[PDB]
Amino acid sequence: FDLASLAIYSFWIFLAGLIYYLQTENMREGYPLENEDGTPAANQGPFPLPKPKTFILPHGRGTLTVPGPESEDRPIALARTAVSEGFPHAPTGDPMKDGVGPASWVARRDLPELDGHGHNKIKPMKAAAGFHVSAGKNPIGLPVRGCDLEIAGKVVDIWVDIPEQMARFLEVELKDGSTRLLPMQMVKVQSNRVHVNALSSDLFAGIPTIKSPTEVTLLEEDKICGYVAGGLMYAAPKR
Amino acid sequence: AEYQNIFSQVQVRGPADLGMTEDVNLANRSGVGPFSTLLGWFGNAQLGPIYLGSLGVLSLFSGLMWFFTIGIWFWYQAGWNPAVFLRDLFFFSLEPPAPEYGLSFAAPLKEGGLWLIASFFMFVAVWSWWGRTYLRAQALGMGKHTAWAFLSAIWLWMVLGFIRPILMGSWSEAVPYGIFSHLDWTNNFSLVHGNLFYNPFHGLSIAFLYGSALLFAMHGATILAVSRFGGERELEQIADRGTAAERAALFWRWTMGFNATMEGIHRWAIWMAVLVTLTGGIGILLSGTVVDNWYVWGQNHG
Amino acid sequence: ALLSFERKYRVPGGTLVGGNLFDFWVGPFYVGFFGVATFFFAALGIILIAWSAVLQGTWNPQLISVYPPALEYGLGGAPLAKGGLWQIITICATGAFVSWALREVEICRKLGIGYHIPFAFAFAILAYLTLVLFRPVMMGAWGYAFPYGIWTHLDWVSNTGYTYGNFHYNPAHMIAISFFFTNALALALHGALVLSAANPEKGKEMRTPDHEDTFFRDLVGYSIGTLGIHRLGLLLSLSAVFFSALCMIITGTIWFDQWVDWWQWWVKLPWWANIPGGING
Ligand code: BCL
Ligand code: BCL
Ligand SMILES: CC[C@H]1c2cc3[nH]c4c(c3C)C(=O)[C@H](C(=O)OC)c4c3nc(cc4[nH]c(cc(n2)[C@@H]1C)c(C(C)=O)c4C)[C@@H](C)[C@@H]3CCC(=O)OC/C=C(\C)CCC[C@H](C)CCC[C@H](C)CCCC(C)C
Ligand SMILES: CC[C@H]1c2cc3[nH]c4c(c3C)C(=O)[C@H](C(=O)OC)c4c3nc(cc4[nH]c(cc(n2)[C@@H]1C)c(C(C)=O)c4C)[C@@H](C)[C@@H]3CCC(=O)OC/C=C(\C)CCC[C@H](C)CCC[C@H](C)CCCC(C)C
Ligand SMILES: COC1=C(OC)C(=O)C(C/C=C(\C)CC/C=C(\C)CC/C=C(\C)CC/C=C(\C)CC/C=C(/C)CC/C=C(\C)CC/C=C(/C)CC/C=C(/C)CC/C=C(\C)CCC=C(C)C)=C(C)C1=O
Ligand SMILES: COC1=C(OC)C(=O)C(C/C=C(\C)CC/C=C(\C)CC/C=C(\C)CC/C=C(\C)CC/C=C(\C)CC/C=C(\C)CC/C=C(/C)CC/C=C(/C)CC/C=C(\C)CCC=C(C)C)=C(C)C1=O
Numbered sequence: 001f002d003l004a005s006l007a008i009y010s011f012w013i014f015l016a017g018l019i020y021y022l023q024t025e026n027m028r029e030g031y032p033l034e035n036e037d038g039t040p041a042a043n044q045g046p047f048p049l050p051k052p053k054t055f056i057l058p059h060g061r062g063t064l065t066v067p068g069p070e071s072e073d074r075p076i077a078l079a080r081t082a083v084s085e086g087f088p089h090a091p092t093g094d095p096m097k098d099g100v101g102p103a104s105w106v107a108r109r110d111l112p113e114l115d116g117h118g119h120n121k122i123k124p125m126k127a128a129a130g131f132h133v134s135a136g137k138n139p140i141g142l143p144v145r146g147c148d149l150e151i152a153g154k155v156v157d158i159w160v161d162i163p164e165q166m167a168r169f170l171e172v173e174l175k176d177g178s179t180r181l182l183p184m185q186m187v188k189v190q191s192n193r194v195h196v197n198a199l200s201s202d203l204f205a206g207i208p209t210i211k212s213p214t215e216v217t218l219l220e221e222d223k224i225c226g227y228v229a230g231g232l233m234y235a236a237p238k239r
Numbered sequence: 240a241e242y243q244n245i246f247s248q249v250q251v252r253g254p255a256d257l258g259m260t261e262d263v264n265l266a267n268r269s270g271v272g273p274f275s276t277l278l279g280w281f282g283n284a285q286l287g288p289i290y291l292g293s294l295g296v297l298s299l300f301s302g303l304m305w306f307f308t309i310g311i312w313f314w315y316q317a318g319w320n321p322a323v324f325l326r327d328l329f330f331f332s333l334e335p336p337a338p339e340y341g342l343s344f345a346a347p348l349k350e351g352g353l354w355l356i357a358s359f360f361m362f363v364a365v366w367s368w369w370g371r372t373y374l375r376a377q378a379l380g381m382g383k384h385t386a387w388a389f390l391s392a393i394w395l396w397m398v399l400g401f402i403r404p405i406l407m408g409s410w411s412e413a414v415p416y417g418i419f420s421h422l423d424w425t426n427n428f429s430l431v432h433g434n435l436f437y438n439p440f441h442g443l444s445i446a447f448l449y450g451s452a453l454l455f456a457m458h459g460a461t462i463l464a465v466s467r468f469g470g471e472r473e474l475e476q477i478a479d480r481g482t483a484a485e486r487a488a489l490f491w492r493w494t495m496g497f498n499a500t501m502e503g504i505h506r507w508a509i510w511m512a513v514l515v516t517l518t519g520g521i522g523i524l525l526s527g528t529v530v531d532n533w534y535v536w537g538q539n540h541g
Numbered sequence: 542a543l544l545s546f547e548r549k550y551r552v553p554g555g556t557l558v559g560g561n562l563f564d565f566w567v568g569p570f571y572v573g574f575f576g577v578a579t580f581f582f583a584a585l586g587i588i589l590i591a592w593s594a595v596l597q598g599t600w601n602p603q604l605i606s607v608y609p610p611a612l613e614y615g616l617g618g619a620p621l622a623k624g625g626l627w628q629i630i631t632i633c634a635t636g637a638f639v640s641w642a643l644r645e646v647e648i649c650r651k652l653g654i655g656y657h658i659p660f661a662f663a664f665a666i667l668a669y670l671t672l673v674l675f676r677p678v679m680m681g682a683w684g685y686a687f688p689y690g691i692w693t694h695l696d697w698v699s700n701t702g703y704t705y706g707n708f709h710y711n712p713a714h715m716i717a718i719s720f721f722f723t724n725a726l727a728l729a730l731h732g733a734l735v736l737s738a739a740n741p742e743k744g745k746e747m748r749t750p751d752h753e754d755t756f757f758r759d760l761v762g763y764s765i766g767t768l769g770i771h772r773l774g775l776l777l778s779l780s781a782v783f784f785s786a787l788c789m790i791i792t793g794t795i796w797f798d799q800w801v802d803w804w805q806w807w808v809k810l811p812w813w814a815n816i817p818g819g820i821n822g
């Protein structure tokens with residue numbers, strides 16, 4: 001007989017089922033798989049989509065049910081470079097402006113993330129009661145330099161995550177008096193400047209702008225973060 | 240150079256965050272502790288508040304009694320000499336009853352009794368703390384995943400000190416409380432059962448342990464890599480997938496041909512972790528009870 | 542086939558070598574110059590394992606074992622059937638792993654993401670190389686490396702460890718294990734915490750990270766925070782592997798006696814060395 005043999009055989013049956021379950025749970029976004037033209041792929045693999053689950057979202061924001069119909073919900077300015085599958089797709093315009101490649105953004109909801117109390121999670125520090133810089137070089141006041149070593153603007157605030165008490169963006173004022181948000185993760189605060197490797201100074205103007213000066217929506221965050229990260233590949237030319 | 244978001248460049252602080260209320264009895268929350276700027280370079284600066292109700296007090300009291308029972312035994316072994324206490328600290332050990340005592344509670348204090356008292360206090364501390372992990376989640380309306388995950392760790396602990404010794408018929412089989420002595424116990428356990436490398440549940444426990452380091456290295460790296468797109472705001476990425484979650488998925492899709500989602504990586508995570516101690520407790524529990532010698536067993540099975 | 546949201550990312554660019562020549566995919570897999578290198582190294586390696594299998598006289602994957610040259614060969618080359626295949630296979634492995642890492646770098650570049658992943662992977666690669674390259678070279682023979690076999694490599698672990706008594710007494714090994722156990726604890730907690738907020742009690746709204754901080758503060762008096770926990774996992778994992786490589790690189794080189802005896806430096810400090818009492822007096 002043997003209880004240890006029963007246990008090891010049983011465990012391997014269990015683990016196979018567990019892996020099957022875990023894989024299907026991980027197909028709740030992005031599937032069914034598509035051809036390059038957006039139509040459903042003929043081979044979906046041996047794992048089926050899981051039965052749907054529904055997340056109840058806080059503050060009257062509704063629900064998310066996944067899996068569900070996938071749609072990009074935005075135009076994608078790319079075209080095939082080959083006559084068969086598997087090759088890159090070339091930007092049909094300016095990929096920074098069009099938001100493709102590493103400049104890509106997702107059509108998230110055009111509302112701000114809220115905290116557990118239903119208040120905007122990210123606020124400019126100037127509007128965040130009691131918030132202040134508590135350690136490190138305070139970036140407010142510093143000129144902002146791009147990868148061309150030219151000054152694009154000056155830091156006029158920090159946008160802070162209120163519940164998690166963290167710096168999320170720098171607000172940078174440009175020569176025309178408008179501002180843009182830069183992700184904190186993409187700037188280097190130095191003693192005499194903030195340096196931004198991803199963008200040359202002349203690309204700061206094109207950072208997507210926010211529709212209201214004291215809040216930022218998840219859609220806007222995705223457009224800002226995407227554009228800034230896309231500069232690593234695309235700031236290149238010059239001239 | 241390029242910033243990597245391993246330590247923060249600038250810290251911000253606001254009023255102390257007293258937390259969400261939900262159904263929590265606020266009367267049992269402490270005030271906040273001090274803020275630590277040192278910690279704040281890597282994680283949150285804020286210390287406290289802590290919740291401590293009757294169960295938490297019982298758990299801390301009992302845990303302290305466990306630690307102090309072992310500790311006074313150490314002092315005793317030190318001949319009450321502070322110099323000797325520091326010198327031989329890792330050599331002291333509170334040991335269980337000899338095998339001749341079986342599972343009785345009749346061993347003298349100095350020959351197992353104190354081990355039983357200490358173990359009793361540990362039993363109460365850990366299970367009351369388990370109760371806390373459940374009730375703290377319940378009071379906030381959260382699922383009970385933590386209490387379930389903690390139960391996998393509790394399974395190995397219980398097998399080691401309680402279930403296996405009871406099934407073997409003596410407390411002498413349990414783990415002593417000492418730094419070196421518990422490592423000596425572990426080595427001996429393996430030698431006596433024919434080399435645990437031949438126990439398939441041990442090899443699995445190792446696959447999950449190593450796999451937990453593989454996976455948290457993958458996952459931590461991944462989230463940091465997409466932190467420039469808000470990647471660590473995982474709950475909202477679950478609710479409203481963003482370019483962080485898509486770039487993360489596609490890194491792995493392009494690398495190894497498949498990927499996770501922002502929620503599902505956490506299910507891979509919780510299982511990779513818990514399976515360490517679930518498979519481990521099974522492997523230990525069968526040892527000596529069902530299988531005297533894993534080498535021998537492996538010659539007739541697999 | 543592509544994920545529904547994938548096409549917009551499949552642009553040209555990011556390669557380190559070859560320009561557009563290997564800038565394409567096979568199914569889900571990105572290729573790149575380093576995809577070709579990984580394929581060459583892996584394939585050659587696997588072919589050489591199969592030839593080793595033929596020279597050993599077995600196809601059973603639980604029996605195939607490729608051993609390094611015996612200690613008498615020192616750091617020279619050995620005949621292919623007597624350690625040379627191991628040597629070439631190790632070159633292939635190292636080539637395959639480093640190529641995999643560099644391919645990961647080409648993928649990060651195309652996606653516009655940080656390089657944290659391949660940097661992390663490099664710790665694993667360096668632990669591998671500590672075992673098969675740096676340690677053997679410092680010890681003066683390829684034969685101190687581990688053999689490539691599912692079970693024979695465990696034989697090497699047990700034989701190497703017991704060469705120094707109970708290996709548990711290696712202080713770097715104690716640190717390494719503490720990081721491995723701490724990492725698994727942190728992984729369980731992190732997975733649990735996020736799922737418990739995303740999947741709250743029946744009928745309830747998803748919780749927020751605020752609830753996640755609250756839960757931990759309530760339980761232990763501290764929350765490391767959603768950025769911190771990912772920093773922490775990465776540090777705990779990589780520290781575990783750093784201290785593993787460390788624990789082995791010092792073993793057989795700077796310390797080669799029984800590890801238990803290392804601890805005598807402390808017990809024998811003159812201010813308490815001769816005091817009566819205790820385990821040691
Ligand atoms: C010479 C030694 C033997 C051997 C003997 C053993 C024995 C004996 C055991 C293991 C076990 C394990 N071994 Mg082995 N092992 C050997 C060789 C190895 C090698 C190797 C590279 O050679 C590796 C990688 C491992 C790896 C492993 C792990 C996978 C596993 C433990 C998992 C775990 O998380 O435990 C750690 C987790 C716990 C102990 C859970 C603790 C939970 C409790 C509830 C915590 C209470 C806290 C307390 C109240 C204090 C609070 C203090 C706080 C500050 C408040 N072994 C050799 C062959 N190994 C264990 C196992 O499961 O084997 C199947 C085990 O019992
Ligand atoms: C009797 C045996 C001795 C002992 C002797 C040894 C010896 C000897 C060693 C260890 C090592 C370790 N031991 Mg010890 N150890 C013992 C008891 C234990 C116990 C315990 C509970 O008792 C534990 C928890 C541990 C724990 C550990 C870890 C600290 C460390 C192993 C991990 C590591 O190096 O990862 C590092 C990770 C790697 C090496 C993996 C590299 C992966 C590569 C880069 C990629 C592979 C890709 C693959 C080919 C792809 C295939 C195809 C795809 C899957 C499709 N030991 C007993 C006392 N221990 C080892 C160590 O520190 O090594 C540096 C080591 O050599
Ligand atoms: C699933 C596998 C892994 C796992 C999971 C896990 N552990 C858990 C949990 C989970 C999911 C919890 O929810 C629970 C927790 O609350 O974590 C924060 C826990 C926990 N795992 C713990 C420990 C632990 N886990 C371990 C391992 C693991 N835990 C696995 C690898 C290990 C080892 C050996 O590897 C240890 C030591 C505790 C931190 C915590 C459970 C706490 C508990 O039960 O506490 C009761 C004890 C007290 C209330 C008080 C004790 C008092 C002290 C002993 C003395 C302190 C006094 C002195 C003034 C300070 C001295 C400090 C020194 C000791 C350094
Ligand atoms: C540094 C922390 C931890 C870590 C991290 C880590 N590992 C990683 C990564 C990271 C961040 C990846 O990005 C990468 C990955 O793609 O994971 C999905 C990877 C990876 N970790 C892997 C495995 C692995 N990692 C381990 C460990 C760890 N990885 C650490 C604990 C272990 C062990 C034993 O603990 C293993 C087995 C692979 C899944 C993947 C690397 C894939 C790769 O390199 O692919 C290219 C190579 C091939 C397809 C095959 C090469 C074949 C050889 C030419 C011949 C075989 C030689 C081999 C030496 C024989 C060994 C026999 C054994 C029986 C001893
Ligand atoms: C969604 O987002 C999330 C958040 O955001 C919202 C979160 O907030 C959190 C919550 C997360 C946290 C609150 C952080 C949790 C913290 C950890 C998991 C651990 C962090 C730990 C470290 C950074 C350091 C650990 C140190 C290591 C590994 C090196 C230590 C090496 C050793 C060899 C230890 C040796 C110890 C000895 C010899 C003991 C000394 C001698 C004695 C005689 C006393 C012994 C006493 C005892 C009681 C014996 C038991 C001892 C233990 C257990 C020792 C403790 C061990 C240590 C290693 C310290 C999560 C999960 C999350 O998901
Ligand atoms: C939050 O976010 C996150 C995600 O998302 C949201 C994630 O997803 C993940 C990722 C995590 C998971 C999905 C969880 C599950 C993961 C684990 C438990 C970790 C362990 C993983 C595994 C064991 C899987 C390992 C798999 C691997 C390494 C891949 C398998 C690999 C191959 C088959 C190798 C193939 C690839 C190669 C060779 C490189 C390049 C590719 C090519 C196709 C090369 C082609 C080139 C040629 C020249 C071909 C020529 C062909 C010829 C001549 C003929 C062919 C001949 C043959 C014999 C074939 C994380 C962490 C995350 O945090």
Ligand SMILES: COC(C)(C)C/C=C/C(C)=C/C=C/C(C)=C/C=C/C(C)=C/C=C\C=C(C)\C=C\C=C(/C)CC/C=C(\C)CCC=C(C)C
Nearest residue numbers: 309310311358359362396397399400401414416417418421
């Ligand atoms: C300065 O000095 C003072 C005294 C002030 C403080 C110093 C204290 C010291 C030095 C403390 C040292 C503590 C140490 C070194 C502790 C080490 C502990 C270790 C390594 C423990 C390891 C494993 C323990 C296990 C697996 C225990 C499992 C126990 C159980 C499952 C409990 C089972 C319960 C039993 C047997 C009781 C049964 C009775 C009932 C009623 C159920």
Ligand SMILES: CCCCCCCCCCCC[N+](C)(C)[O-]
Nearest residue numbers: 019023044045046047496497498
């Ligand atoms: C050790 C655990 C390894 C688990 C790997 C299982 C994953 C297979 C998933 C491939 C399916 C992807 N696909 C085709 C649906 O897109």
Ligand SMILES: CCCCCCCCCCCC[N+](C)(C)[O-]
Nearest residue numbers: 269271272286287289761762763
């Ligand atoms: C897992 C890490 C444990 C950290 C423990 C921190 C506890 C601090 C609790 C604050 C208490 C402040 N008080 C009440 C003393 O004033």
Ligand SMILES: CCCCCCCCCCCC[N+](C)(C)[O-]
Nearest residue numbers: 363366367368369370371373374
């Ligand atoms: C020795 C300590 C005793 C353990 C503490 C028990 C608390 C368990 C909580 C489960 C409560 C379940 N329920 C549905 C009644 O809420």
Ligand SMILES: CCCCCCCCCCCC[N+](C)(C)[O-]
Nearest residue numbers: 438439440442443446507510511
């Ligand atoms: C949730 C992730 C699941 C990962 C599965 C990893 C399987 C590792 C294979 C180890 C085989 C050990 N042994 C001796 C039992 O055969």
Ligand SMILES: CCCCCCCCCCCC[N+](C)(C)[O-]
Nearest residue numbers: 045495496497542567568569570
């Ligand atoms: C421990 C073994 C792990 C092997 C898992 C390998 C990953 C499978 C990738 C499957 C994707 C291939 N595809 C898209 C053509 O289906």
Ligand SMILES: CCCCCCCCCCCC[N+](C)(C)[O-]
Nearest residue numbers: 245772774775776777779780783
């Ligand atoms: C010789 C000096 C080496 C320093 C030791 C390195 C320890 C592990 C490094 C992990 C660093 C990355 N992390 C996780 C903090 O982000």
Ligand SMILES: CCCC[C@H](O)[C@H](O)CO
Nearest residue numbers: 598599600601602604605
């Ligand atoms: C009795 C079982 C023997 C196994 C057999 O000799 C091996 O597969 C040889 O490859």
Ligand SMILES: [Cl-]
Nearest residue numbers: 506507509510
């Ligand atoms: Cl699950």
Ligand SMILES: [Fe+3]
Nearest residue numbers: 462473731735
């Ligand atoms: Fe996470």
Ligand SMILES: [K+]
Nearest residue numbers: 125128130131
């Ligand atoms: K303010």
Ligand SMILES: [K+]
Nearest residue numbers: 431432531532
């Ligand atoms: K035996």
